[PDB]
Every structure is written in structure tokens, then in C-alpha cells.
Write a protein that binds this ligand. Structure first.
Ligand SMILES: C[S@@+](CC[C@H](N)C(=O)[O-])C[C@H]1O[C@@H](n2cnc3c(N)ncnc32)[C@H](O)[C@@H]1O
Ligand SMILES: C[S@@+](CC[C@H](N)C(=O)[O-])C[C@H]1O[C@@H](n2cnc3c(N)ncnc32)[C@H](O)[C@@H]1O
Ligand SMILES: COc1ccc(C[C@@H]2c3cc(O)c(OC)cc3CCN2C)cc1O
Ligand SMILES: COc1ccc(C[C@@H]2c3cc(O)c(OC)cc3CCN2C)cc1O
Lengths: 335, 335
């Protein structure tokens, strides 16, 4: 059975959830076989080879995003205390977790790199009125969304830089730099960390959160021709999953102070909530998308892609009860 | 059964090898239970707590050493290609491995910190005639042994600094600094690495080899009152076993370039060879030691201590076919 055939059934909604989950789980299982080595000697050889290789290197309407994601449209792993924690609660708990671990205090200048729909920017600005909070995003629609939300919430301490972070040049420095699940998109990590350090003083802290595997790194791409999923979700070679310790090898310009991981069931519950909410709001979602997409068929395609991303994310992050893929967090100061 | 009673039988040679091995293996088994956590989240919490805590912190005659150790009296893990590799061959292979991984080239200035009986110093000096090689040791007997060996081998490119490395002050810099199983004795690691960096230029490399556990760190000390072994071998709290990745968190002043581990069976074969050679030369050893120790009883005590160290080391490093305790190696440049 070919890719084309599976992709055919998928688009027609002819693959039931149980089969879909089973297929994607199998794909991730093969990644685990690829990544785990027989000895720690071989594991480190494989991991260092990956790290060395690194060193040589239409937007959805906001009404749709609001129908699929939680209240602040957080697009990153959330934190669920209880089985009954709602996605809105989990967003807030995640925001609070970042503020604790990044040691945010009232009065600081704060920069949020790849701020998305600005949930974290708005959270910090509201909770700490004397902080000035800057979000940086490459999306004009995101910038406009954040500035509108700041206005509605009577926040006067928010600004947004519209920039490709890899191209952004400034001599401005910040007390705190936050990077929440943005580094996975960075083509040049050593260069990224170097640039961040130039936006820091000796008093600054840098907090990074990234999806990881606990043991090994990999690009998010097909191992083989049986893998229809990876290239469906990310049709570009644009996402890297670092191991939980990979960034320890990128301390040319910054120095680690603390390091944590959050078990993958938190991420799994996040994507599950998004999937369920999208399913609940399916009719509304299709109506919102139709104008901008042009046909019900193109609508179905965008919906299939997002829903499959959630179904696949579930299998990835829940694997072995959250103990394979998870979220890594690190705190650094400038050299 | 009390410590005193086991220590009593041990000293009298009333514990056979099989029972001795079994007892020590059990002790290490309990350390593994202590060190492995149920989730990577908890593992990292435990490991970072250890790293944070670190940041707040009569000699045997040479004739005896020659009867127990290999030809160059290497007192560190060796490297065995074959099951029939002799300890002398394994010493040389280990020396060569260090030269490759530390990128030693003819003409460099080289410093070997805690050089022991100087096997590595002599190896480099002989193989690279244009290198100047300095060993640093806190032992007058070691210094004298190395200088005598250099004279006999017609080596003109060797010097030895007699110093406590933690107290040594100098503005001299070196192209290469080697630290072979010395860091385990360092009370202040952040301070040690800082000092080393002041002896480096922008062109220098630092190579560190240390016994490790692949997953977690621990001091070499008793967990409980059932552990008669740890405090017998090291009656002081003077030895730390870092995890294979612990030094990645000590990059304030140096930056990692490469990282390896050597499976623990190499160390196990090393201590096995020492134990067997001592056993072979037992009568001679007792004769050599008697003058300086004063009684056959004090002789037996020193021999029991060394032999047990080997028997225990065997169980530690061979555990799970070398995949628990092993040797970590790292290459750094100066910030
Ligand atoms: C996984 S989302 C995380 C968004 C936000 N941090 C959150 O937690 O909801 C990563 C974000 O990085 C942004 N991004 C990716 N590459 C970027 C670049 N080169 N410059 C700026 N932003 C970028 C994307 O547009 C996206 O909003
Ligand atoms: C495990 S032995 C390794 C010896 C040698 N590198 C080898 O591979 O055979 C560690 C050595 O470090 C030395 N040492 C320990 N603490 C020291 C200190 N503060 N200053 C200098 N040498 C020290 C000990 O005397 C011992 O020779
Ligand atoms: C960090 O990896 C990723 C980075 C970006 C994306 C796309 C981004 C995104 C990122 C997430 O991490 C995520 O929750 C997992 C959900 C979403 C929703 C779609 N939005 C545009 C997906 C990823 O899987
Ligand atoms: C690195 O831990 C240690 C450091 C120093 C010692 C003492 C030192 C030594 C160190 C070794 O690593 C070793 O081979 C394992 C053998 C020997 C022989 C005795 N000599 C004086 C023992 C250790 O176990």
C-alpha cells in the first residue's frame, strides 16, 4: 500500500481514528528504533554527530484559531494539573510555570521570541504592570491580533516587533528573553544563541522551552517511504526535535543555570484538547474557512491536516506514558 | 551482621572471592536503585540538585607499584582491543586514544594534571620530540620517578611541577591540558575549570577523562550502614563520580567541542589485570612492603585494601556489561 493510497483514504475521512492512531504510533515506534543505540558509547557518538551537523548549517483566520485552540490561542505544550483541567486553565498554568522558571519580576524588560498569538506576552504584561513586554513575530496577522488584545485589556506596556528573528538587527537589550517552542524552527542554532546573547546584559536571563526526545535528536522528516505522516504535517524540512540535553552543547555565548523537562502527557493532553474542541466546533470551523480557501474541498484539506497533526501529536507525546517525546526547558545567563 | 564482623572476616582472608564479589555487587545494585528515577523529569531534578550542590563547595614504594600495575604504572582505565590484550598493551592503547582525542601534535606545549607515575607524559614526550611536556603532581615520589624514567629513556623534553593543583599559581599557558581521572578528586569543580582556562589561550584544547555513571552523579560514600565497602576503599569523602554529562553544566569558562564515553568493561579488564598481577606477585609484594610498613599485619592490610579495590571495581564497571559505570571523555576550548 502506497503513500498516495493512504493519503487518499485520509483526505476522504475513510481512516477511522483507531486505525489512524495505530498507523502514526507505528511510525513513531520506528523512529525510536532508529534513535536508540545499544551502548551509551554509541548513543553519544550518534548524538554528537547530530550536534556537529547542526553546527555546519495564507494564514488561518483568528476566528478559526479561536474555535480550535484555547482562550489565548497558545500554540505550545500546556500544563495540566488535573484530569479535569481545561485547556484554558492549562494555558494559564503553563504561562505561570514559564514566569516562575524564567524568574520574571515586576519592572523587567521582557522579550518573547516567536510570540505567536501573544498569550505569554499578554499574561506577563497584565500580571506585572511595571514590566515592559515586547513580542517578536514574523506574522503581520499575529502582531495585529496582539495589539488589538492589548488595547481591549487596557494594557499599555506591550509592543510587538514584526521581524524574521534571524534577520533582526538591534542594539536593544532585555532583562529577560523567552523562547517558547520557537527554537525547533531555527535553521542555525549556534548563530541563533549568539544573536540572543547580544540582546542580553550581564544581568539578563534567557529561558528556552522546546519539544524534545529524552535521549536523541532528529529532524522531523520521514525515515522511509512507509512514513506518509512526517512530510504531510511539515511538507518542508523545517522542524528539528533536539534531545533533552542537546542545547547543553550550545554554550559558546550563554551559560546554563538550570534544566528541566515536562513529561509528554502534558503535550498529549494539549493536542487532545485542541482536537476535541475542533471536532466540537467542526461545522463552525468549515464555515469560517470557506471564504478564504475558496472550496469545501480546500477547507476539508486544511482541517484534515490540523486534526491529523493533533492525532499524531497525541501518539508521539503519550508514547510510554510521556517518557519518550516531551518538553525540555533551560535557563541561561550570558557568558 | 555488622560492618565490624564483615571487616573482620575480610582482613583475615576468610571471605572467598565469589562471596566478596557478590557482596560488593549488591552494594552497587543499591546505588543504582538510589540513582535511577521513575521519569526523566525526576531524573533531571535529581541530577541538577547534585550539580547545584557542587557549585556551593605514606606512599607505596615504586617496586610494589611495578609488581601490581602495568609497565608504565598507569592508574586509570586502560583500553583493551582483544580478550588477550595485556595490561601493558592496554596502557599503550589508552595513551594513544588520549593523544588522538586531545588532538596532540608535534611541537605543542602539553600539561598533564595529576600525572601520576607519568605514563602519559613519557608517552607523549617520546612520540613527539618537539613537544614540551609538563606533568603536575602533588607527590614528590611521583615527580622523582618520572624524572628518573625520562633520564633513562633519554627524553629531554619533560619537566614536572610539584604542586597541589588547587593552590598552583602561574601565568604560563599551554597548547594542551590533559586531566586523566584527576577531576574525580577535585573538591571545587567550577573553580578547577576556571583555573584551567587561565592556563589556556584561544588556540588551546582541554581534554578530560573521568570515571562516570551514564545517568546520574554520586559521591563515593556509603548510602547506608550495610555498606562496608565505600568507606573502606576511600576512608575520606574525597571521590565524586560525575554522570557522563555532568561536566556539560560546567561551561562557564570553557566550551565543549566533543564528548565520548568508553564502555566500563575496559575499566573492568584494567582492575582485573591489576588484581591478577598482584595475586601472581603476592609473595614478592609482601616482601617489598614489609620494611616500610613495619609488620606483616600492616602489610596484609595494605594488600587487602588494594585487592578489594580491584575486586569491587570489577563488579562496579562490569555491571550490565559495562553499561552502568564507565569512563567519560570531553574536549573543550577556552570561552
Ligand atoms: C510553535 S509556535 C509557538 C508560539 C508561541 N511561543 C506559543 O507558545 O504559543 C512558534 C512560533 O515561532 C514563529 N516563528 C518561526 N520562525 C520565526 C522566525 N524566523 N522569526 C520569527 N518568528 C518565527 C512562528 O510564526 C510561530 O508563531
Ligand atoms: C586516578 S590517579 C590518575 C593518575 C594518572 N593521570 C594516570 O592516569 O595514571 C589521580 C592522580 O591525581 C593526583 N592528585 C589528586 N589530587 C591532586 C591535587 N590536588 N593536585 C595534584 N595532583 C592531585 C593523585 O595524586 C593521583 O596521582
Ligand atoms: C514545536 O513543533 C511545532 C512547531 C510549530 C508547529 C505549528 C504551530 C504549532 C506548534 C506546536 O508546537 C503545537 O503544539 C505541539 C501546535 C501548533 C499549532 C500550529 N502552529 C502553527 C507545530 C509543531 O509541532
Ligand atoms: C578515579 O577514581 C579513583 C581515583 C583514584 C584512585 C586511587 C588511584 C587509582 C585510581 C584509579 O582510578 C584506578 O583505577 C580505577 C586505580 C588507582 C590505583 C590507586 N591510585 C592511588 C582510585 C579511584 O577509584
Amino acid at each position: 500500500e502506497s503513500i498516495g493510497e493512504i493519503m487518499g483514504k485520509l483526505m476522504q475521512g475513510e481512516i477511522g481514528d483507531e486505525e489512524l492512531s495505530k498507523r502514526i504510533k507505528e511510525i513513531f515506534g520506528k523512529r525510536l528504533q532508529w534513535g536508540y543505540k545499544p551502548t551509551h558509547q554509541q548513543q553519544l557518538a550518534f548524538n554528537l554527530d547530530f550536534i556537529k551537523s547542526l553546527k555546519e548549517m495564507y494564514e488561518l483566520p483568528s476566528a478559526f484559531l479561536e474555535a480550535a485552540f484555547g482562550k489565548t490561542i497558545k500554540q505550545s505544550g500546556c500544563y495540566f494539573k488535573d484530569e479535569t483541567t481545561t485547556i484554558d486553565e492549562a494555558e494559564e498554568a503553563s504561562h505561570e510555570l514559564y514566569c516562575e522558571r524564567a524568574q520574571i519580576k515586576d519592572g523587567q524588560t521582557v522579550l518573547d521570541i516567536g510570540c505567536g498569538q501573544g498569550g505569554l506576552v499578554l499574561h506577563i504584561a497584565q500580571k506585572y504592570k511595571n514590566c515592559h513586554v515586547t513580542g517578536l513575530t514574523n506574522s503581520k496577522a499575529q502582531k495585529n491580533y496582539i495589539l488589538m488584545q492589548a488595547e481591549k485589556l487596557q494594557l499599555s506596556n506591550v509592543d510587538v516587533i514584526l521581524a524574521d528573528v534571524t534577520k533582526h538587527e538591534s542594539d536593544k537589550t532585555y532583562d529577560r528573553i523567552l523562547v517558547i517552542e520557537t527554537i525547533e524552527h531555527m535553521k542555525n542554532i549556534q548563530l541563533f544563541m549568539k544573536k540572543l546573547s547580544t540582546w542580553m546584559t550581564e544581568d539578563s536571563l534567557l529561558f528556552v522551552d522546546h519539544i524534545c526526545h529524552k535521549t536523541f535528536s532528529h529532524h522531523f522528516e520521514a525515515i522511509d517511504e512507509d512514513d506518509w505522516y512526517s512530510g504531510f504535517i511539515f511538507p518542508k524540512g523545517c522542524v528539528t526535535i533536539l534531545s533533552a540535553s542537546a542545547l547543553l552543547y550550545f554554550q559558546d555565548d550563554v551559560t546554563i543555570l538550570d534544566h528541566w523537562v515536562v513529561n509528554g502527557m502534558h503535550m498529549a493532553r494539549s493536542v487532545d484538547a485542541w482536537r476535541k474542541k475542533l471536532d466540537k466546533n467542526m461545522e463552525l470551523a468549515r464555515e469560517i474557512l470557506l471564504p478564504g480557501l475558496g472550496s469545501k474541498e480546500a477547507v476539508n484539506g486544511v482541517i484534515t491536516h490540523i486534526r491529523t497533526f493533533c492525532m499524531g501529536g497525541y501518539e508521539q507525546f503519550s508514547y510510554n506514558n510521556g517518557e519518550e517525546w516531551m518538553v525540555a526547558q533551560m535557563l541561561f545567563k550570558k557568558k
